[PDB]
Paper text:
The RADAR system comprises two genes, rdrA that encodes a protein with an ATPase domain, and rdrB, encoding a predicted adenosine deaminase domain protein. Here, we determine cryo-EM structures of the RADAR defense complex, revealing RdrA as a heptameric, two-layered AAA+ ATPase and RdrB as a dodecameric, hollow complex with twelve surface-exposed deaminase active sites. RdrA and RdrB join to form a giant assembly up to 10 MDa, with RdrA docked as a funnel over the RdrB active site.
Structural analysis of the E. coli RdrB complex reveals three large insertions to the adenosine deaminase core that mediate higher order dodecameric assembly. Compared with a typical adenosine deaminase domain like Plasmodium vivax ADA (RMSD 2.4 Å),23 RdrB contains an N-terminal extension “insertion 1,” a unique “insertion 2” that divides the catalytic core, and an “insertion 3” after the final catalytic histidine H530. Insertions 1 and 2 form a 2-fold symmetrical interface that joins adjacent adenosine deaminase core domains. Insertion 3 forms a hydrophilic interface consisting of alternating glutamate and arginine residues that create a 3-fold symmetry axis and enable assembly of the large dodecameric shell. Some adenosine deaminases are known to function as dimers,24 but to the best of our knowledge, assembly of a large, shelled complex is a feature unique to RADAR RdrB. We made several mutations along the interfaces between RdrB protomers; charge disrupting mutations to the conserved glutamate residues that line interface 3 (E595R, E596R, and E597R) result in complete loss of anti-phage defense and demonstrate that RdrB complex assembly is essential for RADAR function. Comparison of E. coli RdrB against all structures in the Protein Data Bank (PDB) revealed that E. coli RdrB has no structural similarity to adenosine deaminases acting on RNA (ADAR) proteins, which are part of the cytidine deaminase superfamily of enzymes that use a mechanistically distinct active site to edit RNA. Instead, all the top hits with structural similarity to E. coli RdrB (Z score > 20) are adenosine or AMP deaminases that deaminate the adenosine within unphosphorylated or monophosphorylated monomeric substrates, as opposed to within RNA. HPLC analysis demonstrates that purified E. coli RdrB is alone sufficient to catalyze rapid conversion of ATP to ITP.
Numbering used by the authors:
A (entry chain H), C (entry chain A): 1 to 309, 322 to 619, 631 to 708, 714 to 798
B (entry chain I): 533 to 619, 631 to 708, 714 to 798
Write the structure that this text describes.
């Protein structure tokens, strides 16, 4: 119940609107807590919550504390954090609950409270480090010996959401600019309403300003400096929404002096919080404690909004965010915790901005390396990508530090109202980005040793895999080894997701050792995929037809599923009959022929390095028997009627195919993946109540989770948790270890073997230059 | 409580649930009573006894030693009227306590129960709250307690009115099917309990007994694969239990 | 039978008392051999010995040798040592017998004889190295790749008993001083009588002087220098008991010139012995050969006495013994054989002496590192611990050299006649030692990176584990990570040992990854634990009562052992009735309550960093229901009657609990250890005839040794053999490999896997700073 006192829209609104001298707010904190719990965790049976709150008040009163942030943080810290061996750690039995808590609350206040009220031995000077891990000697020895490998890091840029809070406080007007430019977007209005109904850009700005002013005021009391006089005029937290306070005629600023040069750094935040809690060890003023409460609530609300989601990202285009990234991937020891790091970045449409981003990344990497090895660096102060590469050529893969492999993204956008063919403008923008990348690789061939892979992330439904095939082929020739493509993440139907993975396999130029992505559609079971879903799901006609064709293709040879294959064929022919407005008869065979040509470039021959796939259609048009597939595909691409019918929607039953048939399709795709030796980057992620239901365990082959006809698939690890603050590769490794040891009963050695196999898959299927 | 499985009872619940000390102590005594004779759950019975003695030590603010036996004696007297002799038709249970106070060996249970009823300190401690782990007892032990209560109910021929009702996603997870003995829902050591039907749906508008009968029939026929005849037999047994255990004058 | 001619009190007495010109001593050497064999190995059936001696004389006579040290050493060397690959090695089939021999005879004379009479190729200049190992390519490759890890080295200081002989010859008067100060002790008088009945300090001194004089004389003949004239006056070996010999009126000294600067070094000893045997290759003078025989006998007797056992140890407080220790742990190659070395030392009660010992250890380590890496050392000549730490901070854990982790001991002594509470004065002395350690760690925080662990060794029965809990807690806060405590080594009963291990588990602050010690009580089977034991064993009443309570606690829930649990409860209540002189009724429940409070500090509230456990009893005294346990524990601590009854003795049947019940208790403790992830350092050690009966194989899970309900327990290796000279971690690794391959039939690969798991446990549960 402690999370609802640190993350609550109702509590924030109430505390930020009433005066600072109201006193006696217990009734209201309680009511707001129940509202927050109903809004967030609805399934609590309405009396467990009452009892938990009663126990919380009982603990506070017995320990002679007041209901407030200090007491809540103390309780959380005593419950989760200790001291063991080196620095604070989390209980092994409590790590899962700690992760769930981290999805709502920031860890820095809790660690500050732990350092204040339960410090470790006074010989290990504690420097703040996120996140907090559990301790197990087997896991620590494995990490020391083999290190961890990162293959999936693309969520909030590549940094945890917790430094984004301080970045926003540093650039409040950049953050406000981004929020406004994106609040005009519907998606965003809906998200803001779903988190905080009455958010708006104006209260967003006011909350950021209130957080900044509260931070300044509480820094004053943390240092114990004289409580400036204008504090008396401060009566209502809304007064802090502004850059200055008016006491009597005068306008006083909230700024003060800070010890550290960077006052917005997490070290500075930790120092200020530790000082504040040390001063408030025994008690605190009610008003200032409420200010701290409001600051924590604002921070947690901002982090929730951020995790559930260009410019603030542009501000990560210096050799600072990347240097911190590499220092963080490296542990606190001499030898890095992370050996092979894949760094994913959005490719810019401006050659200048692209050169800019890449120079920043490479120079941050070089600085990180210079802080860990001493050598003749040629250019002691590199200024250009060429100089940075001259520096980096001297670095040997000894294994002491991280080894970087850069992977540009490709963001897929929804098709627009009017274009020559679907995703024409998107394919364009991708073309320009790829052109910029290829010109960079040309003008500097050595960049092929650091740019290893083109991943296409973003929403699945916005662009199919067949759209990126020409781009990936051209990049392969421009010198881009290894390809990645997000598949199976979000799908209108499980069959649709499996079909998407199969299309990616049979259309993308994925070679031996390549990696696909999440591939959730072939890991999630039909049993736990339809748990809160309506009995009928609506999809687009194009997806429906492609799914029917895929079902037919995969269940033709299945003696036990021939009925489903035949029904899929019949339905596919029918749906094609309207989608194409055909008067004649089209068989499932010719439908298959039509739909195997989706990998062709639209503007090849049916509508230097690009020449090959410009003429790739000529072979097709040469084959005398490929008439009707060709004309049908041209109708599929250009015909306005066919495009309207493609965007049309149709309903499909949830049990359209039985669990057995869906598992058969999943296992067919599994077999294809194993045959082509394609790995799956699986980070930990809606339908899972508990982490033990995750499909990673099915893929790893745990008894009770693996299905009879499953095939191993070379799972790799990735540090990408959509809804957590301050996650790490080590954190996810430890989470998997904890789940395996506690929920599946595996011994530490067996659990370590299972997690290590996935981790080593990261190294085996790395994109780094050998 | 005796129909819901431990598996689907802790699905969105916190790992620790807080209760009152009186409920905690009574639960520990009940666990001891029911798992004394279970050879496979003797450890849980012993731990329950030890925790019960401890919690009684503060709840009663006792300085002496109170055994689980005398705790059981104290807590078997909860059926006595408070204002009988320790605090026309009412005369019988006004004096029902006299037999207890006559038994020479019922001293310490009696005084302890009087403290439990009147002592302000004991009442404050009773209203106090304490945390209990969700997995305080394993699923096996919880099912054993459920089946013990089942056996008691079957022996005393007490029926259960089960209307359709938070932790169930789908109606097929309802405990009525476990009670009816459907394969995959019944547990090995279950005992039939004479379930009767009731038209009480907390969160529906315009429900009826016929509606609930048809809902049970539909679930049985479509989700459990039972033929119409078998499903009708299963629902009819519950419905007929309503007539067998009716309160109407014969 | 050859061992009885090199280690025999009777033979030594006879040879040292008769004149050097007696000649013809075969009858007497034979009779003394039979007496020595009866005294040492009694189970030889009185005719196998006759036949073995006959074969020995037959071999000597056929090979034209005389009964003497040269012939015996030649026979042993031909039988055990060869040349293979690099340097001399021991047969794999013969290594077990060689180890048993090393328990009686020193290896240096045998290696000298091998080098003289069967040298290897004349291209590998042989430098003497102890001990001799077998050769197996799998084991050598494993050692080269992973190295060996030492977690238990506390037996004779930390050096082999064989350098102690030369140390005694170097400091005869220090050794004599120690022997006298300790011969007043009964324990020691009994030990001396059991080894050599008529030893006394005076003959001890005379034997040391005789050894020194014989060494000088035989060095003269090894160099071939003119046999000084006073040799003629030397007629009776007792003449060498003195520093000078009187030829005619004059007193001549025995000293001569030695090639090497250190004449008491093992290199010097090897050179002298090799020269002597080379000169005596074909024959030897009878008198000088008898002098060599007497020297060998004296050395072996001294080593036997030493292994079966402060000042001579103080003399190991220079940066020489530790430098040799580290050089020896490092092999002869560039890369060290031993990776993670735990160094255990007795903490001194004088802050000066403690600083002294620690500076010596750290400077020896620094010198060892300087001899293997070249780097800017800041202080080229460190003089203080701070300077040595400045030097050591630059050392990276590359893996080339050993990595040191220091663990102070805590020696437990028997309680004395009069004190406030049992072990009050012992707890005191431990308190002062811990205070010195904490002040050291304060004044130099960097010492926490080298002092990792507080082990409490010494005799188990002299102090229970519950006495060290406050000390370990306070040290944990002072910055001492990792804790160790010897348990299960020696116990009045197997149930008592198992109970001691359980008490250590549930009272000591052992965290995840900590190690306990030998834990023999949970490894030794009840079958082979009562093999020569009386049918009734007597214990103290306190141990009896605690054992009964433990039996009840562990067999309450066992349906098949409820009878034993109930009988244990009844007997516990009865024994408590006298021990406490109670008139009222005390239940087993309240007995359990009383005995769970043994972890409380005695002088807390019932009799800076110490404040926590000074008030730890306040919570107990606050609990309203903890009356009778508290008063009973106070009686247990203070009451003179209860203390007398605690020291009283009572008899317990050997079959008090059946083998099944004892195994059930062992497996319960096993499960506790596995759950808490506590490792067991198991070195090789009274009831085992053959090494194949050792409990390490049961713990490793070998078929025929593991019991049905056993639980794996993370066994680590340790080089601690109580009754051998010149043992090593490599020697014990090879011994385990040999036993596994020859006696259990395991292939080299499987045996290597089994030994490697234990060795790797040493690294996983290392105390070294990460
Ligand atoms: Zn992703
Ligand atoms: Zn030991």
């Amino acid at each position: 119940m402690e999370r609802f006192l640190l993350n609550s829209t109702v509590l924030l609104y109430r505390l930020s609107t009433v005066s600072l001298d109201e006193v006696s707010l217990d009734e209201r904190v309680e009511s707001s807590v129940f509202l927050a719990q109903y809004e967030q965790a609805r399934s609590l049976p309405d009396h467990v919550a009452k009892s938990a709150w009663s126990y919380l008040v009982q603990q506070i009163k017995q320990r002679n504390m007041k209901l407030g942030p200090v007491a809540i943080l103390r309780l959380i810290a005593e419950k989760f954090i200790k001291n063991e061996k080196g620095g604070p750690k989390i209980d092994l039995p409590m790590f899962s609950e700690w992760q769930t808590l981290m999805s709502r609350v920031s860890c820095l206040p809790i660690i500050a409270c732990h350092q204040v009220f339960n410090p470790g031995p006074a010989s290990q000077e504690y420097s703040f480090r996120w996140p907090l891990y559990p301790y197990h000697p087997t896991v620590e020895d494995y990490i020391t010996r083999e290190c961890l490998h990162e293959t999936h890091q693309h969520l909030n840029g590549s940094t945890s959401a917790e430094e984004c809070w301080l970045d926003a406080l540093k650039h409040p007007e950049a953050c406000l600019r981004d929020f406004e430019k994106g609040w005009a977007s519907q998606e965003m209005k809906q998200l803001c309403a779903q988190i905080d109904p009455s958010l708006t850009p104006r209260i967003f700005k006011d909350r950021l300003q209130i957080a900044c002013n509260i931070r300044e005021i509480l820094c004053r009391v943390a240092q114990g400096v004289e409580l400036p006089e204008w504090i008396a005029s401060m009566q209502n937290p809304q007064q802090l929404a502004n850059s200055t306070i008016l006491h009597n005629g005068r306008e006083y600023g909230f700024a003060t002096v800070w010890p550290i040069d960077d006052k917005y750094s997490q070290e500075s935040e930790f120092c200020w919080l530790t000082g504040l809690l040390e001063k408030w060890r025994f008690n605190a003023p009610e008003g200032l404690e409420r200010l701290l409460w409001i600051y924590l609530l604002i921070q947690n609300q901002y982090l929730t909004l951020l995790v559930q989601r260009t410019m603030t990202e542009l501000r990560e285009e210096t050799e600072k965010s990347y240097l911190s990234r590499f220092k963080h991937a490296h542990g606190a020891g001499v030898y890095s915790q992370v050996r092979y790091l894949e760094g994913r970045f959005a490719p810019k449409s401006d050659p200048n901005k692209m050169q800019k981003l890449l120079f920043s990344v490479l120079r941050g990497y070089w600085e990180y390396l210079s802080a860990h090895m001493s050598m003749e660096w040629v250019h002691e102060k590199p200024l250009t990508i060429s100089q940075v590469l001259d520096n980096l050529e001297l670095v040997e893969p000894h294994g002491k530090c991280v080894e970087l492999a850069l992977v540009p993204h490709f963001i897929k956008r929804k098709p627009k109202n009017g274009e020559a063919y679907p995703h024409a403008l998107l394919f364009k923008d991708l073309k320009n980005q790829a052109a910029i990348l290829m010109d960079m690789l040309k003008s500097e061939p050595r960049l092929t040793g650091w740019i290893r892979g083109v991943d296409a992330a973003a929403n699945e439904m916005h662009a199919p895999p067949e759209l990126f095939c020409p781009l990936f082929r051209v990049l392969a020739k421009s010198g881009i080894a290894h390809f990645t493509y997000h598949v199976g993440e979000d799908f209108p139907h499980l069959i649709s997701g499996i079909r998407s993975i199969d299309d990616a396999l049979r259309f993308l130029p994925l070679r031996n050792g390549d990696r696909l992505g999440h591939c959730t559609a072939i890991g999630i079971t039909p049993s736990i995929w339809k748990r809160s879903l309506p009995l009928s799901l609506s999809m687009t006609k194009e997806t429906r037809l492609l799914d029917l064709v895929f079902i037919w293709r995969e269940l033709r040879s299945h003696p036990e599923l021939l009925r489903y294959a035949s029904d899929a064929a019949i339905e596919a022919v029918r749906l094609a009959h309207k989608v194409f407005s055909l008067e004649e008869e089209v068989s499932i065979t010719t439908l298959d022929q039509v739909f195997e040509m989706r990998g062709l470039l639209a503007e090849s021959e049916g509508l230097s390095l690009w020449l090959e796939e410009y003429e790739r259609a000529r072979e097709l048009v040469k084959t005398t028997g490929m008439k009707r597939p060709l004309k049908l595909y041209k109708q599929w691409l250009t015909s306005d009627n066919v495009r309207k019918q493609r965007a049309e929607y149709v309903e499909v039953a949830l049990e359209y195919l039985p669990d057995e048939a869906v598992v058969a399709l999943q296992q067919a795709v599994m077999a294809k993946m194993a045959d082509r030796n394609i790995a799956i980057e699986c980070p930990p992620t809606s339908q899972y109540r508990n982490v033990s239901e995750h499909h990673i365990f099915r893929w790893m082959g745990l008894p009770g989770e693996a299905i009879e006809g499953d095939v191993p698939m070379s799972i790799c690890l990735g540090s990408d948790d959509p809804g957590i603050f301050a996650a790490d590769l080590k954190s996810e490794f430890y989470h998997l270890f904890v789940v395996l040891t506690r929920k599946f009963g595996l011994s530490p050695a067996d659990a370590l073997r299972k997690v290590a196999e996935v981790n080593e898959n990261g190294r085996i299927y790395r994109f780094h230059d050998v």
